[PDB]
Design a protein around this ligand. Structure first.
Ligand code: MG
Ligand code: MG
Ligand code: MG
Ligand code: MG
Ligand code: MG
Ligand code: MG
Ligand code: MG
Ligand code: MG
Ligand code: MG
Ligand code: MG
Ligand code: MG
Ligand code: MG
Ligand code: MG
Ligand code: MG
Ligand code: MG
Ligand code: MG
Ligand code: MG
Ligand code: MG
Ligand code: MG
Ligand code: MG
Ligand code: MG
Ligand code: MG
Ligand code: MG
Ligand code: MG
Ligand code: MG
Ligand code: MG
Ligand code: MG
Ligand code: MG
Ligand code: MG
Ligand code: MG
Ligand code: MG
Ligand code: MG
Ligand code: MG
Ligand code: MG
Ligand code: MG
Ligand code: MG
Ligand code: MG
Ligand code: MG
Ligand code: ZN
Lengths: 16, 108, 240, 45
RNA sequence: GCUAAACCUAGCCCCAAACCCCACCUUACUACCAAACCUUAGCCAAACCAUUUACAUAAAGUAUAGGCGAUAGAAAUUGAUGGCGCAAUAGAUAUAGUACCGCAAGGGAAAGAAAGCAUAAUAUAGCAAGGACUAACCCCUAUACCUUCUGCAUAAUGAAUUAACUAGAAAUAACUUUGCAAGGAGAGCCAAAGCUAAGACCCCCGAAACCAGACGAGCUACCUAAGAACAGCUAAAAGAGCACACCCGUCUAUGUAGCAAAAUAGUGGGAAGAUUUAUAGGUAGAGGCGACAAACCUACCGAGCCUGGUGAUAGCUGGUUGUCCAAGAUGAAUCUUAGUUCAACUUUAAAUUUGCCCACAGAACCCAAAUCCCCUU
RNA sequence: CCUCCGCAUAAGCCUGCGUCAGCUGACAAUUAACAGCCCAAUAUCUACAAUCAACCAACAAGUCUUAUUACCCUCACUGUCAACCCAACACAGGCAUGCUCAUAAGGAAAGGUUAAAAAAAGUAAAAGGAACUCGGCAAAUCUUACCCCGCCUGUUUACCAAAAACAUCACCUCUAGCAUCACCAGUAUUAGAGGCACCGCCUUCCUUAAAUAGGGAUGGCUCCACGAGGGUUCAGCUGUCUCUUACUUUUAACCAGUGAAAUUGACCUGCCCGUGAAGAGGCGGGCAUAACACAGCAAGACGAGAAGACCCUAUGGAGCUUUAAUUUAUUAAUGCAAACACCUGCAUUAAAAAUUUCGGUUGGGGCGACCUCGGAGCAGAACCCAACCUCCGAGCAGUACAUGCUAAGACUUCACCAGUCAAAGCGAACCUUUGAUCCA
């Protein structure tokens, strides 16, 4: 088993 | 199963610009001779129906004020009367819902 | 670890003392003894193993009344609350000790052998040779340390000079100055052997737990093996 | 089944990673010193 | 015409110089009760590994040391403010040690001023082009690229695509061009044409690991302290029966980027005990804990995690970016056959003089094709 | 219409559906009696459970302070919200306690439509009733009997194994004669460790129609009970099956909103035969061939997922065991010195460990063979030529003791290392194979 890797939250929380 | 190759824009256009996918032109649209509004042949005129719904809502608010509580449906007919109207002979023995506006032209 | 032994009480008392279980752990918090843990909560009754302890501002042989004989969670042998003068103390009850009995504790080494009555404590020099004894001291006034388990009885094998030879319940001889005190008879609860635990749960109540990995050395338990000498290496394990 | 290994309790948090425990040993003091050198806003937990 | 594209200073790099109110160690930021010092190891090199290696100038890589081998290695003596830097994927990680991730140690950002589509889907046939043609297609020709292989369209590897970034660092000795020349060199060094100076030449990513020091027992294993829960019926003081709560996880189906990094539904085991469970505390990494399953120790435990040594090492895989021309192809030893050293081959430059082909003559007794050798040519 | 739901406390979180105006900002809010935050000391005290505590029943034996001396001032401080916490999420999971036992509390399975396949869940089913199948799995329904294993209740591979494995009372063996940190405030009827397994007694036929199934003719036995254990069976039951069908829900498909992931060299992406790095959409020869959606299928794209599984290699790791090699630094014993029990140094023996290694070529049904040198054939005639190839031989001896010293020129096992031959000369006389360096 290989653990999942989470991408940094800032990338997907951006707003205009 | 996963795609074996990226689908090209040319193929994608052939697919998603097919007539089966294009929006069809509607040919049942016409003008309501009453008010001149657009309507579909088989459907009610939206504007006229909005008129009727608003008037119905007002009449129903009056009915609710008159009834005053749930489970008070009358066992007698109802008649809506506008300003300057009097219960007729056949309107006798029917609950009168009084409206403060004048009789609409389309209401008879 | 922040382990401080519960055995901090300094003054003797009759009241059972709240004793903290160890789980077989050191003060470091690591397991030192395996198979220990859980069990019924127990209270410790301080046992006075120095049977000849004359009261304060008092001396010489003294008698004591057996207030009661009680079960002790912390021992195989049952104990006796026994009172003398104006004090009470817990002692190890002998086989036939009953409530209301009288017990004699003396330090007098009579020229003749004192009539050995079960339960009383005399210096070993005062006992007839061959009497059954328990709660034996190693040194005069040290306090009983040997022959303390239920039903155990040493034998006063010999008396010569100021030295007595005792047979411990392990059938090993021991030399003790005849001035050291011992109590006559075998310890109480003689049927402790015949008790049948019956189920694993009862041992778990008694605080014994099933524990593995009891050795912590590389490879675990390893029985001793005779290392062959060079001449015998040829025949250590002859193939069939 | 897994994932919820953190069962928060402020008592354990402070007793395990607090300022007092960090200062209780030279190793913890060096932990604090490293955080200070790095410029951490939160030196201890 | 959309998305976008672009920009220049915010700062940074390398040098020089100069030596730089109140609260808070208790659960930190809480007004106020009776004790420090102690060899680093290991990776790595030795093609394993075990001693060993691996934490001004000149004398000199000399004396010395060394499985006398890899390699290590003196001293006597001598005396000595700037930028052919970066300019927002660069330069500091930095707008910030912030956000965010982690229980913790710890990790640690981003950013400010073409591609893809749409205008405008599509026409028999085919690496999508080329030769063409009046003409887009129709005709004819044409088995993507890279890498790895004896040999790849290969149904071997890699690549959706665009932008940006991303990989040959240096000595010994040569050669070339200067200077001076039996001397050269700005002490030391070399010298039987040498010496002095310059020019040219030696990559990138990747393990599982090992050791040091921290951090972790809010999960889980076990334990300590003091708590709590266990209906109803049957039975009578039960590791008792049936069966709720509760705990578990037998079997089946579903789910399989899922509701879920282990769940759901049904079914099932225990359910007053060796039970389950809240709270706080303890045991720490060759260690703990373990009713031994190599089980568990913060989702990935035959030995945790983080930081450091560390740009570990890799005879192994992958990658290695302008144009053009030229020469260029199949034994020995080796813990060695996935490698290397020598040879052979190969390339360049230089010297001077025979080189290949080659008939006649010539090359063995024992018991065939040809070959070797060389006057001529 | 639905709910082991709901309300509180704890824990956790920390303003996270209150108002207002434009998710953002502003404004507001939880008020102590509940809860937390305590105690002036010295000593001396404190045997007698609990279980309605009264009988009864025990064993596992069970939270249990006054005197004296000081001292009078008084209700401060803090928590109080929520639709909430741990799981990256408005996550079907995790989540203690008190009460409500179906709710007085809390909620909404259907965005609209249609009524396809496949798929999920459920209901019903003629006749039959295990013929299904590895197996009665699942479902439906009641049951019988018997074997194997383990005595039993328990524990275990969190996330493929719950078991016959582990533990377990019982029993056996070994070790220990003793106190102030475990064992243990214990003492041989004790403690520690290991083994074993409760306990107790002695030393071809049947089954079927058909039967690779099942049952029976210290050791040897005895299975009381138990078991989601593993087998077999009677009877029943059933859509397991003969042999499938119907309906409902979900999914589905269409409409509206929002909107991923693996994947992807480019593709203008056909069939047959042949060929080819040996399996062709793409090459050769034929055949076919307007262009596009939508829904299905899973034969191919050696289809997509982890530089898969398995096998081999690496002078790559790591683990384990040892009569592998090297050590005993450290402990434990001794001995010798050294200080007059304790301690230092030096030896020896152990324990415990520590570090390190796993040569090569050959051999599928073995129980190894080989590794250097030389002779013969392969390799016929200069030289040279392999093999797990076909055969043979050697690790020196005999001799003498010029079998000395020197030295032109040569050969050379395809490199080097090494190995050969040798005129002349000097000096006596008058020969025919194994191995380097360092180190000693
Ligand atoms: Mg917990
Ligand atoms: Mg090495
Ligand atoms: Mg010097
Ligand atoms: Mg930057
Ligand atoms: Mg463009
Ligand atoms: Mg390919
Ligand atoms: Mg490959
Ligand atoms: Mg690819
Ligand atoms: Mg815990
Ligand atoms: Mg009950
Ligand atoms: Mg029970
Ligand atoms: Mg366990
Ligand atoms: Mg095992
Ligand atoms: Mg195993
Ligand atoms: Mg982990
Ligand atoms: Mg590398
Ligand atoms: Mg050429
Ligand atoms: Mg060798
Ligand atoms: Mg190699
Ligand atoms: Mg709904
Ligand atoms: Mg719908
Ligand atoms: Mg039927
Ligand atoms: Mg059958
Ligand atoms: Mg049947
Ligand atoms: Mg069949
Ligand atoms: Mg079943
Ligand atoms: Mg069992
Ligand atoms: Mg499992
Ligand atoms: Mg479990
Ligand atoms: Mg299972
Ligand atoms: Mg059968
Ligand atoms: Mg069971
Ligand atoms: Mg839609
Ligand atoms: Mg073919
Ligand atoms: Mg293809
Ligand atoms: Mg289709
Ligand atoms: Mg591979
Ligand atoms: Mg040669
Ligand atoms: Zn109208």
């Amino acid at each position: 088993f290989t653990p999942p890797i989470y991408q940094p939250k800032f990338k997907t929380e951006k707003e205009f | 199963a996963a795609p074996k190759n990226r689908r090209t824009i040319e193929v994608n256009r052939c697919r998603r610009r097919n007539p089966q996918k294009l929006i069809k032109v509607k040919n049942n649209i016409d003008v309501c001779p009453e008010c001149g509004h657009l309507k579909q042949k088989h459907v009610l005129c939206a504007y006229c129906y909005e008129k009727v719904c608003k008037e119905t809502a007002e009449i129903r608010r009056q009915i609710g004020k008159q009834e005053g509580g749930p489970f008070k449906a009358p066992t007698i007919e109802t008649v809506v009367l506008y300003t300057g109207e009097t219960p007729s002979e056949q309107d006798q023995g029917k609950r009168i819902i009084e409206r403060d506006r004048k009789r609409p032209s389309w209401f008879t | 670890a922040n382990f401080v032994s519960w055995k901090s009480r300094t003054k003797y008392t009759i009241t059972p003392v709240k004793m903290r279980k160890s789980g077989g752990r050191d003060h470091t918090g690591r397991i030192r003894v395996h198979g220990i843990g859980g069990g019924h909560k127990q209270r410790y009754r301080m046992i006075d193993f120095l049977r000849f302890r004359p009261e304060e501002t008092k001396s010489g042989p003294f008698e004591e009344k057996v207030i009661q004989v009680r079960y002790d969670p912390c021992r195989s042998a049952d104990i006796a609350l026994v009172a003398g003068g104006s004090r009470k103390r817990w002692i190890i009850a002998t086989e036939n000790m009953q409530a209301g009995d009288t017990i004699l504790n003396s330090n007098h080494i009579g020229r003749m052998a004192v009539a050995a009555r079960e339960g009383d404590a005399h210096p070993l020099g005062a006992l007839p040779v061959g009497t059954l004894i328990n709660n034996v001291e190693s040194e005069p006034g040290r306090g009983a340390q040997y022959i303390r388990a239920a039903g155990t009885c040493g034998v006063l094998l010999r008396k010569v000079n100021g030295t007595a030879i005792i047979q411990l319940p392990s059938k090993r001889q021991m030399q003790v100055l005849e001035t050291c005190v011992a109590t006559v008879g075998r310890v109480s609860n003689v049927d402790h052997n015949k008790r049948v635990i019956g189920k694993a749960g009862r041992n778990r109540w008694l605080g014994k737990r099933p524990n593995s990995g009891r050795w912590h050395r590389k490879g675990g338990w390893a029985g001793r093996k005779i290392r062959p000498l060079p001449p015998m290496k040829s025949y250590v394990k002859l193939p069939s | 089944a897994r994932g919820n290994e953190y069962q928060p309790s402020n008592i354990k948090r402070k007793n395990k990673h607090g300022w007092v425990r960090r200062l209780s040993t030279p190793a913890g003091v060096q932990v604090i010193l490293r955080r200070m050198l790095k410029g951490r806003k939160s030196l201890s937990h």
